[PDB]
Amino acid sequence: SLLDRGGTYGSPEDGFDPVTVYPEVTRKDRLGNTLVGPSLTGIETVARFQVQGQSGTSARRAEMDDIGDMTEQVYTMRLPRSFTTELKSGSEVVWRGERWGVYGEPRRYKGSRRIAHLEYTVRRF
Amino acid sequence: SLLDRGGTYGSPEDGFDPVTVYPEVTRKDRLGNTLVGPSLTGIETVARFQVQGQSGTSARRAEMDDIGDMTEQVYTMRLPRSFTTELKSGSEVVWRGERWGVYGEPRRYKGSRRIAHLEYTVRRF
Amino acid sequence: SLLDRGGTYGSPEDGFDPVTVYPEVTRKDRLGNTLVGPSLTGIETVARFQVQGQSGTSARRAEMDDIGDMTEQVYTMRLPRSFTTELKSGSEVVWRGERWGVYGEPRRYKGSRRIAHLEYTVRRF
Amino acid sequence: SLLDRGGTYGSPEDGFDPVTVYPEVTRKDRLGNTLVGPSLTGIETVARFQVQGQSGTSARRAEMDDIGDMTEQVYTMRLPRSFTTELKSGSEVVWRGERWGVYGEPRRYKGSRRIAHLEYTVRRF
Amino acid sequence: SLLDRGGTYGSPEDGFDPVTVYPEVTRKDRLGNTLVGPSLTGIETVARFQVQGQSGTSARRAEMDDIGDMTEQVYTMRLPRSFTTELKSGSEVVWRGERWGVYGEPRRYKGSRRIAHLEYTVRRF
Amino acid sequence: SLLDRGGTYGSPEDGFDPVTVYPEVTRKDRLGNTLVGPSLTGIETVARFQVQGQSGTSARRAEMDDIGDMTEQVYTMRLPRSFTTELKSGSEVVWRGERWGVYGEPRRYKGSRRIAHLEYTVRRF
Amino acid sequence: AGKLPIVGEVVLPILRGHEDLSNPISTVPSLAGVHVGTWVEDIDSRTFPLITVRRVGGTRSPEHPTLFTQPVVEMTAYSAADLPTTEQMYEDALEVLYRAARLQTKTPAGYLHSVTETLGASHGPSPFDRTWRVFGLIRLGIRPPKN
Amino acid sequence: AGKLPIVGEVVLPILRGHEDLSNPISTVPSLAGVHVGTWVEDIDSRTFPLITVRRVGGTRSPEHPTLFTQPVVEMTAYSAADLPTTEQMYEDALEVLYRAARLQTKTPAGYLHSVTETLGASHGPSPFDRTWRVFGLIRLGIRPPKN
Amino acid sequence: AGKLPIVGEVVLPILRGHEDLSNPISTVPSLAGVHVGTWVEDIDSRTFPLITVRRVGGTRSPEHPTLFTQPVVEMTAYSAADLPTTEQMYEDALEVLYRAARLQTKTPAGYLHSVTETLGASHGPSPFDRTWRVFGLIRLGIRPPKN
Amino acid sequence: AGKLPIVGEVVLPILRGHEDLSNPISTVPSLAGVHVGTWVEDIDSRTFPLITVRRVGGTRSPEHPTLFTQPVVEMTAYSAADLPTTEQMYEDALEVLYRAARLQTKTPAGYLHSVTETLGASHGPSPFDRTWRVFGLIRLGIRPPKN
Amino acid sequence: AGKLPIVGEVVLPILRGHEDLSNPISTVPSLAGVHVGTWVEDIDSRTFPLITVRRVGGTRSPEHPTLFTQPVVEMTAYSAADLPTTEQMYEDALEVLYRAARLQTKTPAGYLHSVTETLGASHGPSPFDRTWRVFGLIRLGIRPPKN
Amino acid sequence: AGKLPIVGEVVLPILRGHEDLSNPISTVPSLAGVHVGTWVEDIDSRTFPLITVRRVGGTRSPEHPTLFTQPVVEMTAYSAADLPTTEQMYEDALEVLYRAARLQTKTPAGYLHSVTETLGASHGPSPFDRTWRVFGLIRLGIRPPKN
Secondary structure (H helix, E strand, C coil), rough: CCCCEECCCCCCCCCCCEEEECCCEEEEEECCCCCEEECCCCEEEEEEEEECCCCCHHHHHEEECEECCCCEEEEEEECCCCCCCCCCCCCEEEECEEEECCCCEEEECCCCCCCCCCCCCCCCE | CCCCCCCCECCCCCCCCEEEECEEEEEEEECCCCCEEEEECCCCEEEEEEEEECCCCCCCCCCCCCCEEECCCCCCCCCCCCCCCCCCCEEEEECECCCCCEECCCHHHHECCCCCCCEEEECCC | CCCCCCCEEECCCCCCEEEEEEEEEEEEECCCEEEEEEECCEEEEEEEEEECCCCCHHHHEEECCCCCCCEEEEEEECCCCCCCCCCCCCEEEEECCCEEEECCCCCCCCCCCCCCCEEEEEEEC | CCCCCCCCCCEEECCCCCEEEEEEEEEECCCCCCEEEEEECCEEEEEEEEEECCCHHHHHHEEECCCECCCCCEEECCCCCCCCCCCCCCCCCEECCCCCCCCCCCECCCCCCCCCEEEEEEEEE | CCCCHHHCCCCCCCCCEEEEECCCCEEECCCCCCEECCCCCEEEEEEEEEECCCCCCHHHHHHHCCEECEECCCEEEECHHHHHHHCCCEEEEECCCCCEEECCCCCCCCCCCCCCEEEEEEEEE | CCCCCCCEEEEEECCCCEEECEEEEEEECCCEEEEEEECCCCEEEEEEEEECCCCCHHHHHEEECCCEECEEEEECCCEECCCCCCCCCCCCEECCCEEECCCCCCCCCCCCCCCCEEEEEHHHH | CCCCCCCCHHHHHHCCCCCCCCCCCCCCCCHHCCEECCEEECCCCCCCCCCEEEEECEEECCCCCCCCECEEEEEEEEEEECCHHHHHHHHHHHHHHHHHHHCCCECCCCCCCCEEEHHHHHHCCCCCCEEEEEEEEEEEHHHHHCC | CCCCCCCCCHHHHHHHHCCCCCCCECCCCCCCEEECCCCCCCCCCCCCCCCEEECCHHHHHHCCCCCCCEEEEEEEEEEEECHHHHHHHHHHHHHHHHHHCCCCEEEECEEEEEEEEEEEEEEEECCCCCCEEEEEEEEEEEECCCC | CCCCCCCCCHHHHHHHCCCCCCCEECCCCCCCCCCEEEEEEECCCCCCCCEEEEECCEEEECCCCCECCCCCEEEEEEEECCCCHHHHHHHHHHHHHHHHHCCCCCCEEEEEEEEEEEEEEECCCCCCCCCEEEEEEEEEEEEEECC | CCCCCCCHHHHHHHHCCCCCCCCECCCHHHCCCCECCCCEEECCCCCCCCCEEEEEEECCCCCCCCCCCEEEEEEHHHHHHHEEEEEHHHHHHHHHHHHHHHHHCCEEEEEEEEEEEEEEEECCCCCCCCEEEHHHHHEEECCCCCC | CCCCCCCHHHHHHHHHHCCCCCCCCCCHHCCCCCCCCCCCCCCCCCCEEEEEEEEEECCECCCCCCCCCCEEEEEEEEECCCHHHHHHHHHHHHHHHHHHHHCCCCCCEEEEEEEEEEEEHHHHHHHHCEEEEEEEEEEEEEEEECC | CCCCCCHHHHHHHHHHHCCCCCCCCCCCCHHHEEEEECCCHHHHHCCCCCCEEEEECCCCCCCCCCEEEEEEEEEEECCCHHHHHHHHHHHHHHHHHEEEEEEEEEEECCCEEEEEEEEEEEEEEECCCEEEEEEEEEEEEEEEEEE
């Protein structure tokens, strides 16, 4: 099934790119507030990325010139189901050597024990 | 079938998750206004959760850093028709061990005596 | 014929709820303005309710905490063609013992002498 | 065909309602500005009215209560092809003994001799 | 072949209208600014007009009445593919004896040598 | 394959136009800020342009007169897979003798070895 | 002295030219047959021309809160005829207020003591159909009835 | 000595006419049966006519922060009846506050020391189905319980 | 002394150069052939150049409300020619209003007493296809037509 | 004298009653168990009651920029209990800041010199599920530490 | 003596360095080859760097309306090169206005009598692909030509 | 005595601690490694922490427009670390500008003559992925270089 295909970081299948995935951890700041952010130790894995965000109110935001050379990219992202770790919204991913944030908590699909999977969004800006 | 389908809290069908459901009660505040909120005694049951979706105006609200580590997660919820208790806008649900509020009154479908059911929304945030 | 379907207030058939319908009258305020509102005497009938008026991403309006606590519900309503009285926008309905306002004038469909019917929106907020 | 079946003001088909239609006339105001409005003499004819899709923001303005009792309602109106005079923005129509304004110019379709027709929007505020 | 098909100005085809097309020129103003506008010499030809319509954000704009008697009309225009001249957005068209501006540059469709054509918007307000 | 079809700058296929393409180069301004823009030496290639679905809120923006003669044009743009160089935000293209900016980063479609390609958007304003 | 009135129980008899609050058609010669009220009626009974008066808000006087008050009203005029008739109708309504203040006119609910425009007659977009709108703000002054 | 109260514990006994904070129905004879409180209830419990008071700025006094406060409250009045009834009901609520201030009324939580409108009774749009809102800002003054 | 006019019955004869109100084309030689009015016509009727004068504020004088008034008029020039021609057409309209004020120009409806600018000529976006707008606010004084 | 601090290193020990910056739970008798911080934590971690202090403006003193500062902080109190508990909790946060100013409290990062409400307690819309918010602006005064 | 011009006929020859109004590129040494004009040309004709001048307000002088006027112009500089080149070009243009005022520069349409900024060189977002913008308001003052 | 510079040629050497305009990494002890610039780089190049300065206003001096100028810069500071670190980084940037003003520091482009906050260090929303922004407006004063 497409949910279980993928291979491994040293040799992926066809649609999957190799990634390093940094799951979330919590740190205290100087004044004792707790902040979420990516862990220092990443997990080698593979992921399925697909384009997103093409709606007319968001497609305008792709490049800007107001205060800097800002751009925004959006992709949906999925790990194969053999990846048992969950990326909470503070997590990050290294894909193609770029560093991409996970964006919001994972969407859970659960219709039956063979359909069930998690899908993420990643964003870079 | 799917409207009546759910198992017990100790033994779900594979499409359903066990939840503790806190139906609404009213309390007086310190100045005599009645406030709705969740009861202190929960009903153990099972529920079917599906992602409520996105738009170019609302997807950008899934994660924020204006004043804090905000996120928002929207799921529709259905309870099997053997559950005769009705939840209301002040009610809460515990799902995966984390606490989710009901959002707005139930959407009530009654096309015919065999199609009829209620669907809820739950919102975290 | 789903347009002629539905029983009477004491025994409604399956898709229909019994309701009391308060058609519009005009009162005068103490300064001589006329105002539309519901009559003091209501007509007992059966009616079919469905879950939305028109589509929209602004579903965030369904529950609020800005001042007091508030919800908004919208249902499309229809009455069997034997009900010859027309409900103007000042009228009201009692459904499940709650009190629901008609919202805007009735929408008239009249494609042919067997298709023709009126449909209403109702709200509670 | 449906483009030109409508009967007469004393005897319509079933899909059509009898109307008095007041064509465009232009007039000077007190200061010599050239206004436009309905003629004093109407033409008796028949017309096909269908509910307009208010499903954007307009469905939230079908009834409002900020300044007075106010209720925008919108229909799409068409006259049989045997009716040769065009209506214009700020022409008016009498339907069910109510008075309805034409809203903006006619939409003009001209795919071929077989398809060609004009369609109008009408409103009441 | 609806792209190549069309009459001469004195004798249009089924579903085409005769127009006088005023192509682009640049003029220099009193202070040396360079302005686009319509040429003084028109090319007589035929054109295919279809309504572009309004989305719910803009259907309200068809008859405005705040500063004056104002309306807006939007039509999509195509010229027979034998017309080699191009209307560069400052251009104007006379259709039914009234004067319409081209709005924005032409849209170029060029997917294949037999499917290729230019389409224009024309507008009047 | 409509992917990798296009031919060469001297002799394009039907769907393709010859373009000169100026890839990304990075430069310092007077104050040591690191800016991005088109290289001074462009590759010669062929490209497939299709009108992007500029609609609603963005359709009215096609032409303006608030400060000058202004228009926007938006095309999706794609290159044959033999073109191994990647364009980036602030790269530029000469198409039809006009100069066009790549707008935002390329969109990566990667589903499998046969399907995989990059698509760009270009603008001129 | 009685209680201070709500502003509608004083302004409306001054614009209407009679003390019958149940009858919104004015009879003062400058405004014969206009409908004067505080609330625009439903379209199935709404009649133009009409003048709408509503409180935009101004305080009691701080010197004696129970003896004198200064309500700001937004006054508006609507017509289906033309913009000049809508301007002239606002001017002719404002001329009744400036006279009824000079004469210190008694109303069964209170006395119209003084009048002052805080924003003069101005053109704006109308909420409904063919009609034009002209509006402005008047700071009134009201004294309680002599009971 | 005492401690300065939250503004609701002083205003609500004065608008309601009784010291029992648990019972929101007013008994003052010009406001009999009006529901008075800080927070409008769910539609299954809510009733009209209704008054509600919200804290909307206004500081402790600079020269003695622990002895006198000048809280602004937004006061709002709602009815399902008609627009001139919500004007009369808001107007009758000022008549209670000005009397209760000049009489220097004690409440278990503090003394109402003075009252001043800073934005007078104003008509506005209502967030509830077929009801009229009238609103204004009142700058109060409060002193702590004497004990 | 007669009644004060609506501002259009005085400003328009000054900008047009004749007191026939039925004919909107000007004859004043600095801006001859300009259509001068208060309300922009339907697209099948309107002609450019165009000047629009529109009442945007300004009260009667408080000293004697029935003897002198100071309307604020938004004046707007439109053309299809170019931006400089729209500027010069607005300048050529001020140069007529200031001269007509310097003379105390009589009209059948009243006297133009004084002219002043509260916001000078400024460029802005136009609501009409391929035209330029220049606009500003004039405050101008009016007196009754004797009699 | 040492360097002037960020405003959080002075205000938070004064609202918490600890010198320990690692521990956000307040121990002051009127605010026991209230979480006091500058940033709202993730949903899986946050707890109510909560107080948030956040710098909105306020300059160094212009006549000795390195020796006195007047930072303006927005202080916001949030609760899941009810609106009265939320405004009482903000009220009890002022009563701590004013006391801590009179007693001239030393904090390891600096001295709290003075306190002034720029915009008093006000109710507002809350960004979280089923909680109440009240907020105001405090202009503080800060002096550098002694070393 | 003469008539007051549209503002463009005074400042454009002063920024360009020649009295030929048909030739928009400047020859002033600090601005060689900059395009200077009221209106931005079509995308097939635009060149950068570019300066634009728009009137934004400013009246005739109230005490002699025919003899002096003080137009506020927005001046805006655009470049495709970098932000430093854009704010350099704006300063290098503003240096020409301050010199041309000190020299009382005669232009065939009038004299530039004085110059004064009322907003200075603010950076802002540009409406054109890959370009920087800086803008400000200058209150000029201009006198009519001698005849 | 020279020409007045663009504001970036004076502020940036003072925040960076070296005269080399081509090298954006700061070397000042309080800000070592902070990137200081006018313009935020592409995501494939930018590094946090980052200080960024933009001109927002401020005229030349009307006393002598070619000898003194008072540009207003919005200074901003960004970090991926935590909110306290970006507050301390903005404070550490004021402590450089004030000292560099006391010492009247020379730069190749001009002299920094004075410094004044006109809106002090303020927390706001950041446009980047996971970073905290604080900002404020500094009115500088700048004089031209010798000879």
